[PDB]
C-alpha cells in the first residue's frame, strides 16, 4: 500500500503507513546495498538532538514560529525516546554527504509534527521538510554534527569508562601480584626474573597512556560544524546561530560541545574522526598485545607455559572433551584486528575530501562508531569474564623461574660477561644447573652464588 | 522470560524455555555481549546447515551413524536452510576465535529441533546427542572453516562475479557506443591529447575484465574444504574416506564444485585462501573506486566543472541548494571501496596471526570477507542500473574542451621537433590565440601542413 | 685482509682495517637482507648520545673508572661528528631487538677507545665491549632509547618546523585572498560562494589541528627505557641510574627526555611510536587533501578548473611540448600514501610484543623516521616551490562564480526551497540565467533578484 | 657548472655530469628523502626499453641506424652499471616519473655525443626528445620500466627464494614424518600430529602463495609501451607496440607482450596491486611460519623447546650465553613491511585521474622493496634456520604424554561426556589420564593402553 509524495523531481510511491516522504523512499530503492537500515542508530539519535537545537535557536533568533518549534521538538523527543526507529530505513552506502539521512529526519519530523497536530498522514504537512525542519541548515553541517555528537558521546560514555574499568583491574592485579617472582621472556627465550605484578603493571601502563591519547583528541571532536550550512560561510543562518545552536546541543546532551573554530575545516575534512580513531587504534594494538600475553601465560594447562590460571567460563571444544580455552582473549584480539582495518578505511576516507565537502561521511561514521562500541563491549567482557579472576599458577611459576639458565645474569657485575657466559653454556651443553658449573669451573663459591643468584633480588637495582 | 535447565560438561544453565538452543549457546550469548546480538553472518549459519546435513549422510554411508538419526539431523538442517529457525542463532562474531560456540549452537539447535520433530518434548535430552551424533566425526576446527569456504565461494560465484560481469559488459557497450566521440585526454589533471570517450570507457571495461580473472584465479584454493581434519588436521575420529565422502555431499547439496583440502593442516592453521580471494576483491575495489571517481569528475558542474558526460539524475542532491543533482551512485561505490580496503587490512592481519594447529580469528575473517563480497555485488548492480547504463556525452561541451587544448601541438612532434612545437604552444598561451595562427605567424608550419598533421580524429591512433 | 676477533661463540675473521668485531661481522654475513648498512644513521647518532650518557652516569655512580668514561666519550664524540659512518654496516632486518646494532656500537667504541689510548687494532682492547661500553645496559633498553631520541629529535627539529612553515604560508594566503570571491564545490558539483581566502583558511586550520595532534604525543615519546635492562627491572643498574642517565641524554641532546614511568611498557611495546605516528598520519591525510585541491584548482589551463595559477618549476612532459604539471602537489600525495602504509606497518608490529619485549624495534624505527623525514622535506618543497607563489586566476574565477545556478540558494529565505528549485531547474534545462527565469516564472522582481543574489554578500 | 637549456630556459648543470637541464631541475626542486632514491631496478628496465624503442624505431623506418647504435651503446653502459652516478633523482618526484624519463633521455643523448667524439656542453647529435624519446612518453615508458623491473625481480629473485624455502619445509615434512608431538589449538594442549605433518602445513602454505603469485604474472608481463601520451599511441609507427615488446622479451629473456588495453595500462597500476596482493599473501604465511618456529624453539628450559634451531650468534649483550631465533624476527619484520607496502600500493592504485595514474614511483619503490625483502629473508631464513631445524626428541615426548586431550581417543569407545569426566577429574586431581580413566572405571588398564596410543592418533579409523 502506497501514497504519492512529491519532491522537486516529481511523484514517488511511499509505503502508506510510513512517516518518511519522497526523498527517503528514492534512497531506500536507489541504494539496495547491504542490510536495510544500516545507518547507525547513534547517528539518528544525534540528529534528534541537533534538529531540536536548530528549532530552539531558530525561534530565539526570529525565523521560526514557537508553534512549529514545539511540533518539531516533540517529534525529536519521539526519535530520542526510540519511538520511530522503523521510520529510518536508509543504508550507510548512500550519498557520501548523508543528504538522504538528513532528509529522512526532515520528512519524518514534518509528517509526524502534522499528525501530532491532528492532521492525516499524506496531507501537505503544516511543517515544510526544507523551509521549517531544515531551516538554517544543510546535510553538509548537520551530518558532521551528528557524527561528532555520536562519536564524542560513545567515546566518553562507553569507550573511556570500559577501558578505564580494565585499566584498574590490570593495576589491581599488578598490586595483588607484587611479591610473585616469575621468569621474564625476551624473543620467547628464557630471560631474567620480574614479579607477575611488574608484568601486569606494564599492561596497566599500556591502557593509561592509551586513555591519555584518547582524551587528548576530545577538544577537536567537541567542535560542531553546525552553522557552516552548504560550504562553511553560514549562508542562510541568522547571526548568533552557530554559538546559540551549540549551547542547546550542549544543554540537551549534557556534554561540552562548542561551535567549530573553522567551518571550512569542519565540512571539507573529518580530520577530528581520524585524530580520535587513531587513538582508539593505539588502544586496540595495546589491547591485542595484552590479550595475546594472557593466553600465552595461561597456555596448557600441561604442555604450554601455564604460569596463570584464568576463569573457566565454558566448554572450549566440541571434540576435545574437557578442553578449556582463553576465549575472552580471542574476542579481544579479533576486535583489535577489526579496529586496525577500521583505521585504514577512516584514514583513506579522510584523505579523500574535495573542495568544500568530504563526501565519505557515512563510512567514516559507521567505522568510527563500530570501533568505539566494540572496544567498549570487549573491555567490559574481558574484565568481567577474564582479568578479574586471573590467579598465579604458583608451582609452575616457581619451576620455570628456577630452570632459567639466565639467572646467571646476577653474576655479571661479580665475574664479568665472559665468565658468566661460560657458566650458562657449560650448564646448557652439559645438561646441569648453574650452581654446579659455577662451583666446578672455580668461578663462584657455593656461598656467593647462594647470596647473588636470588630472583627476589633481581627484580630491582643493585644495593 | 520462561526457563528450563540444560547441562553441558561444566554445569547447569537456565535457557529460554521456547528456544531450541541449549547450555553452551546460552553461555556464549551471556559471555560475549559485544556489538549487536546475532551478528554471526546468516551465510555462515546457512553454510553450517549444508555441512551438518552432509556430515550425517557421510557418517551414515560409512556405517557409524544410523539412517533414522541421519533423517532427523537432515530435517532440522533443512529447516535452517529454509530460514525457519533464524531466531535460534543469537551468537556474535566476537566469540571464541575457533567459532566453537556457533558450531555448538548448530549441534544443540539440530539436536533439540530433531527431538521435537520425532515427538519429543523440548527440555528432554534429545534422541540425537549434540556431540556424539550431530557433531560425529567433526570439530569446530574443520566445520567453521568449511562454513567460511562454502559462504565465501557461494557469495563470490552467485552475487559478486555476476554483478561485476553485468557492470563490465555495460562499460564495454558504452565503449562501443562512444567509439566515434572525440574528447580531450587529461594527465596530472592538465589538458593533454585526444582519445575517444569510448577508448576512455574501454579502460574501465578492461580494468573489470582483469578484476574478474584475478578473482576467478582464487577459486581453486577457495573450493577446498577442511572438513575431515577434525581437532588438529590428522582426521582423528573420522571413518576411512569421510573427508572425500562429506565433500561429495557438500558439493551435491550446494550445486558448487567443492573438494576436500589437499592439506588439512593448512586448512585449520591458516585462512590463506580467504586472504588470497579478498586480495582480488580489494584489487576490484581499487579499480571501481577509480572508475566511479572518473565518472563524477567527467559529469561535474553542470557549469563550473568538466561536464563532458551526462549521468541519470536519480534524486534531489541537496536539502539547502535547490535543484542541485549529485553523483550519489559514484559516492556509494567510492565509499564501499574504502570499506573493502579496511576489510583487507583486517583479514591480512588476522591471517598472519595463526598459532600451531589453528588460526583462531575465523569469525572476524569470515564477517569481513562476506561484507566485501556482498557490498561489491550490490554497489555494482546499483551503479550499473542507476548510472552506467544511462551515461551519454555532453557533445557541445566535449567539442569546446577538445578544440581549446594547446597540446594538440604534440601532433607536430614528428614534423618540426619537440622544441619548435613548444614555441607554438608557449606563444598561443601568452597571446590567448590558436595553435594554427602561431604555427603560421612564427613560420614553423604552412597552413596546408598544419591542417594535414593536426587532425584530432587522427591523433586517436598510430601514424597514418 | 682479515684479523681474528672472538665472542662467547668462538672465532671470527673481521676485515683487518675495521673497528668492529666478531658480533658485527656475524650480523653482516648472516642478515644479507636489503641494501647494505640500512640501519638509519639517526639510530647510530642516538646511540652515540646514549652510550656517552651511560658512561658518564656509570662514573658518577662509581661503577666505571673516569679514564674509561673519557675514552668512551671521545669515541662517541667521533660517532656524533660523523667520523665513523663506515664502521656501521648492519641492516634494519637483523635481530628484532636491535641486539646486533647495540653490539656494533659496543665493539666500535671499545676498539676505537683502544687506538685513542695508544694501542693497535687487533690487540685485546683496554675497554670491554660488554663489561665497560655496555655497563648497566641491555639492547632491550638501549635500542628503544635510540628510537625515542631519533624520533623526538626528527619531529621537533624537522617535521613540526616544516609543517609550521607551510601552515603560515597557507594562513598568509587566506589573508592575501580574503576578498577573492569564488564558487564553492560540494560533490564536485557547482555550489554557493566562499572566498579563496576562506578555502585556504580551511587548509591553514587542518595543519594547526595536526600540529596540536603531533605535540599531544610528545610527552609519551620523550620517555626513555634506559635503566630497564633485560626485562624492565633495572637488574644490574646502580641505584638512580635510570634518572641520572636520562638527565645526561637530555643535557647532551638539549631535548626534554625523562626516564620512562614504566620500564616494562617501554620494552614490551612501542605504543609511543604508534601514538606519534598516528598523528604524523593524520597530518599526512590532511596534506593529501590540501595538495589534491591545489592540483584540482590549477587544472587546465583551458579544459579544467583553472581557478589558481601555481609556480611553473619545470617542463611537465617529454612528449606534450609546453605542458606544465603541478609536480609539487604529486610529490606530497605520494608521501601521504607512503605514510598511511608506514602506519599499517607500525600499528601491526606495535601489536606483536611477547612477554617482556617487542622484537620489531628496527622495522618500527625505520618506518617512523621515514614518515617524520618525508613529511618535513615535502612540506618545505611544497611551501618554497608551490604554496608561497599561488595567485588567483581572477577572470576565470569570476566567470565560474557568475555561471553557478546555486547562487539561487540566496532566494531560500525569500521565496522558499520549492520556488528557488523551480528557478534553478528551469535555468539549467533552458541554458538561460537565474535572473531571466526568476522573472519568466514571476517569482522575483528584477530589483529584488539584484539586491538578493549578490555573491560578495553570500560569504558570511 | 655548464649551461644546459630546456623549453623553460637556462640551467647551471654540474660540468662533468651526462644529465642536463631537466634532470638538474628535478635534483634541486624535490629535495625529499635520501638522494637518488629512484630504484636502480627502474633505471635498468629503462636501459632495456630505451634500447628496444631505438631498435623498433629503426625497423619501422623513422630513426636512422646511426642514431640507434649510439643509443644502444649508451643503454648497454647503463645496463652494465657504468653510469649509476648519472641518476640523482628521488622517488618523490612528479608522480608520472617524467623527470626520470628525462634523466634517461638526457644521459643517453649526452653519453651518445661523447662516444661519437663530441664534448659535454654541445647539444648532442642525438635529441633527448626527438631521438631518444622518439615514439614515447614518460606515460608509457615508466609503466614499462615498472613492469619489466617488477616481473624480472619476482621470477629471478622472489619466486626462486620462496621455492627454495618451500623445498626445505617439504624435505623436513619427510625427515620428521614419524616424530609424534602434541598439537596446540588456542595455545592449549590438543591431540597428536607428527612434526612432519606440521611442516607439511608450512610447505602447503608457500605452495598456495607461489601459485597465487604465478596467477598474477599474465597481467604483469603486459607492457604499456606504444600508448604514448594518453593510450592512443599518437606519434607511434603502425606495429611499434608489438615490435618494441618483442625487442624487450629478447633483450630480457622474459615473455613480455604489448598490453591488450593501453588506457588500463596508463590510467591504473592494477597489475602492481594484483601481484603485490599475492606477495602480501606470501608475507602473512611467512609471518605465521616464522612465528611458529620461534614458539616451537622457545626456552631452552622454560618455554616449549620442541625443536632445536641453528645457533648463529650471541643472542644478548647482558644475558650471557642466551641464543635467539634471530632469523625468525627478520622474516616477521619483513612481513610487517610488506603489509604496509600493500596499504600504500592499494591507496595509490585507487587514485588514477582520467588518462594517467600519477602515483607511479611510490607504487614502483614499494613493490620492488617487498619483492627484494621477501627474496633476501627467504634465502637467509632457509640457509641460517630452516635447513638446520631438528626435533628436541626428549622434550617432544614429555609434552606429548602430558596432554589430557589424548582422552579424545576414547570418544568413539565411551562417548563425549564419559571422556570429559576422565579429563576433568584428572585436571581437578592433578593426576594422569590413565590413573583416573581406571580409577572411575570408564576404561580397563588393558583397553586404555590399547586405545590411547599417540602414534595411532595421527590418521583416520
Ligand atoms: O544536502 C545538503 O544540504 C547539501 C548537499 C550538497 O552540497 O550537495
Ligand atoms: O570445538 C572444537 O571442536 C575444537 C576446539 C579446540 O581446539 O579447542
Ligand atoms: O642484547 C640484550 O641486551 C638482550 C637481548 C635478549 O633479550 O636476548
Ligand atoms: O612526460 C610525459 O611524456 C608526459 C607527461 C604528461 O602527460 O604531463
TrEMBL record, chain D:
Q: Which domain of life is it from?
A: Bacteria
Enzyme class comes to lyase
Record-linked NCBIfam families = fumC_II, PRK12273.1
One annotated GO biological process:
fumarate metabolic process
Q: Which residues form the active site?
A: 186 (proton donor/acceptor), 316
Q: Tell whether Lyase is among the UniProt keywords.
A: yes
Domain named Fumarate lyase N-terminal: residues: 9-340
Q: What is the lineage of its organism?
A: Bacteria, Pseudomonadati, Pseudomonadota, Gammaproteobacteria, Pasteurellales
- Sites binding (S)-malate sit at 96, 98, 137-139, 185-186, 317-318, 322, 324
**Could you tell me what this protein does?**
Involved in the TCA cycle. Catalyzes the stereospecific interconversion of fumarate to L-malate.
Q: Which residues bind substrate?
A: 96-98, 127-130, 137-139, 185, 317, 322-324
Pathway membership of this protein? Carbohydrate metabolism; tricarboxylic acid cycle; (S)-malate from fumarate: step 1/1
Q: Where are the residues marked Important for catalytic activity as a site?
A: 329
Q: Where in the cell is it found?
A: Cytoplasm
Listed under GO cellular component are: cytoplasm
More details: There are 2 substrate-binding sites: the catalytic A site, and the non-catalytic B site that may play a role in the transfer of substrate or product between the active site and the solvent. Alternatively, the B site may bind allosteric effectors.
List the Gene Ontology MF annotations in alphabetical order: fumarate hydratase activity
Primary location group: cytoplasm
* Residue ranges of every copy of the Fumarase C C-terminal domain listed in the record: 406-458
Which reactions is this enzyme annotated as catalysing?
(S)-malate = fumarate + H2O
Could you tell me which InterPro entries the record lists for this protein? Fum_hydII, Fumarase/histidase_N, Fumarase_C_C, Fumarate_lyase_CS, Fumarate_lyase_fam, Fumarate_lyase_N, L-Aspartase-like
Protein name (record): Fumarate hydratase class II
Q: Which family does it belong to?
A: Belongs to the class-II fumarase/aspartase family. Fumarase subfamily.
What binding partners and quaternary form does the record give? Homotetramer.
